[PDB]
Amino acid sequence: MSETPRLLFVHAHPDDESLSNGATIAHYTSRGAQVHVVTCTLGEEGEVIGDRWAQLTADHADQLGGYRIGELTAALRALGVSAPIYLGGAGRWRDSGMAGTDQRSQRRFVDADPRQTVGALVAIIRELRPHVVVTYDPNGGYGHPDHVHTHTVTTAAVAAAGVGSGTADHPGDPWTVPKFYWTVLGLSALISGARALVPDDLRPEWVLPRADEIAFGYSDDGIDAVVEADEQARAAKVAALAAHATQVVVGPTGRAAALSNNLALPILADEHYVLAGGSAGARDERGWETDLLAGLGFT
Amino acid sequence: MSETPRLLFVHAHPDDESLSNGATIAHYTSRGAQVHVVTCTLGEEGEVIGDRWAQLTADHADQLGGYRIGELTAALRALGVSAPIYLGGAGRWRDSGMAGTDQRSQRRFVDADPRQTVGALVAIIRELRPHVVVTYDPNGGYGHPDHVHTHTVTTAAVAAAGVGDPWTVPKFYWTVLGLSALISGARALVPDDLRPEWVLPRADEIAFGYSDDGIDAVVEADEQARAAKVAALAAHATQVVVGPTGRAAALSNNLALPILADEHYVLAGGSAGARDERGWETDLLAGLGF
Numbered sequence: 001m002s003e004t005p006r007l008l009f010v011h012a013h014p015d016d017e018s019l020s021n022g023a024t025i026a027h028y029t030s031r032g033a034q035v036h037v038v039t040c041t042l043g044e045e046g047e048v049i050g051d052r053w054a055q056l057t058a059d060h061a062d063q064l065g066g067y068r069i070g071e072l073t074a075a076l077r078a079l080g081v082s083a084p085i086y087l088g089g090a091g092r093w094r095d096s097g098m099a100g101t102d103q104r105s106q107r108r109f110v111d112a113d114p115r116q117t118v119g120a121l122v123a124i125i126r127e128l129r130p131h132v133v134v135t136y137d138p139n140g141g142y143g144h145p146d147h148v149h150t151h152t153v154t155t156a157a158v159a160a161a162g163v164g165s166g167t168a169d170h171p172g173d174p175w176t177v178p179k180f181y182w183t184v185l186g187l188s189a190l191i192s193g194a195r196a197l198v199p200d201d202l203r204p205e206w207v208l209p210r211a212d213e214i215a216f217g218y219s220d221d222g223i224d225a226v227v228e229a230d231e232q233a234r235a236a237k238v239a240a241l242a243a244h245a246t247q248v249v250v251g252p253t254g255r256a257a258a259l260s261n262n263l264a265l266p267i268l269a270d271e272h273y274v275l276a277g278g279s280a281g282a283r284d285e286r287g288w289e290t291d292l293l294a295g296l297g298f299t
Numbered sequence: 300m301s302e303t304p305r306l307l308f309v310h311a312h313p314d315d316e317s318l319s320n321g322a323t324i325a326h327y328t329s330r331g332a333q334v335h336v337v338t339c340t341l342g343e344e345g346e347v348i349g350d351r352w353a354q355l356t357a358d359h360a361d362q363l364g365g366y367r368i369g370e371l372t373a374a375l376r377a378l379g380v381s382a383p384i385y386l387g388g389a390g391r392w393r394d395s396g397m398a399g400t401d402q403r404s405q406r407r408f409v410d411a412d413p414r415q416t417v418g419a420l421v422a423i424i425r426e427l428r429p430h431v432v433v434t435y436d437p438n439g440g441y442g443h444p445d446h447v448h449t450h451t452v453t454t455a456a457v458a459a460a461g462v463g464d465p466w467t468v469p470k471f472y473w474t475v476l477g478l479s480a481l482i483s484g485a486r487a488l489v490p491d492d493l494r495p496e497w498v499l500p501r502a503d504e505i506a507f508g509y510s511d512d513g514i515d516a517v518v519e520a521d522e523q524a525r526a527a528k529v530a531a532l533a534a535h536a537t538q539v540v541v542g543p544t545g546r547a548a549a550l551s552n553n554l555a556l557p558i559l560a561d562e563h564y565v566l567a568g569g570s571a572g573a574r575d576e577r578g579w580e581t582d583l584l585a586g587l588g589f
């Protein structure tokens with residue numbers, strides 16, 4: 001274990017950390033926890049909002065990933081995290097592209113040698129020795145191929161990290177992650193969130209989404225934990241999303257945001273999780289932990 | 300010619316603005332002038348110093364140009380310039396690489412249609428109406444293909460901008476290396492100015508230095524401007540490292556170079572103002588009535 005708590009979030013693209021776990025990250029950094037984010041790709045295949053950087057996309061100059069390094073860096077800082085960590089090194093494994101898009105590249109993350117991807121993340125785990133690790137559920141949240149792959153890699157890495165390896169002269173330093181969570185979308189919290197939005201929250205060109213285009217929400221019964229952050233944490237999440245300016249636009253009141261598809265989304269203080277490995281601590285009347293560190297003895 | 304002076308520097312790659320003109324840019328912005336820099340490529344084909352960003356290069360992830368946007372932005376801000384301007388839009392025309400090289404892209408600046416490149420720069424000039432424009436000499440300084448191309452495009456644009464909305468650039472300069480100042484700067488360096496891996500230069504590693512009689516103007520830096528130049532170079536961390544005393548720097552080849560605040564120019568168009576005992580203007584704006 002040790003004295004200051006340590007948490008690790010493993011994501012696919014720049015912005016995933018803020019969209020999924022921004023409020024949770026800021027929550028824990030503000031309480032003196034050591035939090036790191038690992039990002040598995042630079043996001044080379046992203047769309048761009050606005051004209052200024054529009055020629056950086058893969059179908060033009062194809063330089064978007066390098067630009068998003070600065071966005072990620074600023075977003076992490078807003079969340080209280082000091083620097084990005086790109087799996088295998090910045091630029092190692094390329095954004096694999098949205099589902100269904102047939103993509104040309106011989107460096108795609110989904111195609112990468114599991115020995116290398118898993119090996120890279122085992123090293124990070126063993127170095128950082130996180131008490132909590134967080135990543136996507138098996139369907140990668142909304143089904144993005146890198147999200148699914150990030151889940152597969154991270155699951156395998158968590159399993160390998162605590163197992164003895166290395167040679168007689170170079171023994172591994174194994175670390176068994178105490179608690180392993182999937183970050184997931186809470187269906188009910190989202191409905192509540194969308195329903196609380198007023199026209200003043202939206203930009204004129206944004207459309208509210210209907211049931212069908214949203215999406216893959218867990219029921220309260222499928223959820224094991226929540227971090228219910230305060231307004232200071234939520235405002236950090238807002239600032240982190242604003243920093244990903246090519247990817248995400250925050251509305252006039254900071255209550256809502258939208259990606260390039262112009263679907264308005266609420267920016268919530270509550271973030272939900274499924275416990276995939278380890279022992280739960282105390283659960284409330286919903287059956288949820290209210291602290292990812294629960295049972296680990298920091299309180 | 301509004302009485303606030305307006306200056307435009309046209310460069311090939313991120314860092315060229317600070318290596319060539321950093322002190323001059325800071326000198327003028329600190330004095331309330333309107334200064335802009337146009338950068339013609341993102342520098343996609345650059346090498347990288349250090350391991351952190353090493354896989355960004357064109358023979359790995361090929362994403363370095365997008366990363367260098369932030370380096371340029373920070374460098375510009377250290378010089379008092381609020382934002383980068385990439386010719387034709389960020390990413391329009393690619394870094395063409397060193398001479399002799401070597402690439403898959405057909406978006407190279409050197410191969411670009413003159414109508415588009417010159418057209419783009421003409422629009423910027425008519426928009427900014429600079430009193431002074433600066434770019435490389437005809438050999439592009441040290442001969443980088445993009446630097447030669449930048450000179451060619453800028454020269455064509457300056458000529459075209461004032462022909463029938465039109466702006467005739469009052470004064471057009473080439474930024475050049477001063478031979479004498481480079482020799483003296485190199486000589487003044489001591490091993491403490493360098494980092495472990497760097498090599499002190501000699502009479503050998505010079506090349507394209509202009510003589511004092513071939514120079515028309517100098518902007519002599521005060522300490523605030525030199526310090527801004529040093530901060531700007533430092534911001535281009537993938538390309539340039541400043542030494543421990545801030546008096547020397549080196550690119551990826553590890554050849555130490557003095558950080559010479561005094562920057563020299565050849566008047567390529569327009570009329571000179573007052574010259575000093577060296578035969579040099581000491582202000583690019585000389586004779587324009589500010």
Ligand SMILES: [Zn+2]
Nearest residue numbers: 012013016144
């Ligand atoms: Zn993603």
Ligand SMILES: [Zn+2]
Nearest residue numbers: 311312315443
């Ligand atoms: Zn250059």
